[PDB]
């Protein structure tokens, strides 16, 4: 009867206050349709490619409960992978607690890559002053932490790193990120080896990369001289090459501490509003 939809709506209203089970990353676009046989139609949460999705609980085999990561979002019926696959086979047939969901931490790590190589005092004082701002401002929320392991290494002879950074230790650090993100606190990593955003592309962590831009190589020349410069030039020129629209979420091209900190702080407040809907509490 129609009562099952009412019990479903009750399960949803109960779901809205529930803590997140696990976030996932979509690999395909998906629009809602009446043929989808949504248990509670008009509540379906459609998603574009590479959309992030918090998941609260398993409503049923055909549908999971969860929410999209964006402002104004509310709890709803995120489609199950089996349902998406069944609709895929159906459309192909009509044509005549690989897979659609990559696991991601509930809170994305933030890596402030650039201007160039890490481990040198210029860029080190740069990013460190940045973490100082992020710490004193986002007090009681932000959870900055160092990662000695190279997280970029994370993905019938068993795979093994030839580097001192053992892959098992990397797995341990990844689990530490999975635990740290469970608290829904802000996270901003201080990874050492991550000189370029592309290295983290294979990671399931889905990092919030930050781009502290210096468009002019000569400026950074005079900067590093003002206090290993050449490899720093190839690296900075390399980061200059990268596509801003996708590779980076934020460009800290601002020179003074004040305005740049205002931008990145406003950004993190935007993400903070995105990750914490009123209905959750």
């Amino acid at each position: 009867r129609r009562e099952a939809e009412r019990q479903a709506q009750a399960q949803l209203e109960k779901a809205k206050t529930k803590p997140v089970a696990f976030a996932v990353r979509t690999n395909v676009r998906y629009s809602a349709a009446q043929e989808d046989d949504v248990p509670v139609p008009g509540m379906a949460i459609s998603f574009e490619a590479k959309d992030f999705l918090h998941v609260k609980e398993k409503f049923n085999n055909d549908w999971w409960i969860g929410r999209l990561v964006k402002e104004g979002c509310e709890i709803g019926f995120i489609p199950s992978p089996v349902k998406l696959e069944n609709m895929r086979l159906q459309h192909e047939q009509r044509a005549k607690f690989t897979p659609p969901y990559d696991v991601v931490p509930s809170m994305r790590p933030v890596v402030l890559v650039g201007p160039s190589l890490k481990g040198y005092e210029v860029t080190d004082m740069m990013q460190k002053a940045l973490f100082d701002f992020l710490k004193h401002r986002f007090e009681g929320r932000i959870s900055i932490t160092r990662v000695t392991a190279d997280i970029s290494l994370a993905k019938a002879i068993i795979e093994r790193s030839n580097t001192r950074s053992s892959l098992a230790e990397v797995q341990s650090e990844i689990e530490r990120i999975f635990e740290l993100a469970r608290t829904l606190q802000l996270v901003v990593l201080d990874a050492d080896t991550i000189n370029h955003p592309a290295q983290l592309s294979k990671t399931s962590l889905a990092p919030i990369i930050v781009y502290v831009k210096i468009s002019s190589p000569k400026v950074l020349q005079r900067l590093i001289k003002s206090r290993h410069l050449n490899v720093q030039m190839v690296a900075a020129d390399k980061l200059a090459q990268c596509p801003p629209q996708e590779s980076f979420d934020v460009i800290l091209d601002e020179n003074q501490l004040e305005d740049a900190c205002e931008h990145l702080a406003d950004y993190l407040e935007a993400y903070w509003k995105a990750t914490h809907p009123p209905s959750s509490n």
Partner: peptide, 29 residues
């Protein structure tokens, strides 16, 4: 006169150093 202006102009039609001073100010912090 303005016609002479348009005549010359019809065919006639610092960030580096600012980045230098501002980023030196950045390391200065």
């Amino acid at each position: 006169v303005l016609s002479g202006e348009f005549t010359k102009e019809r065919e006639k039609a610092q960030q580096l150093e600012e980045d230098l001073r501002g980023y030196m100010s950045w390391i200065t912090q």
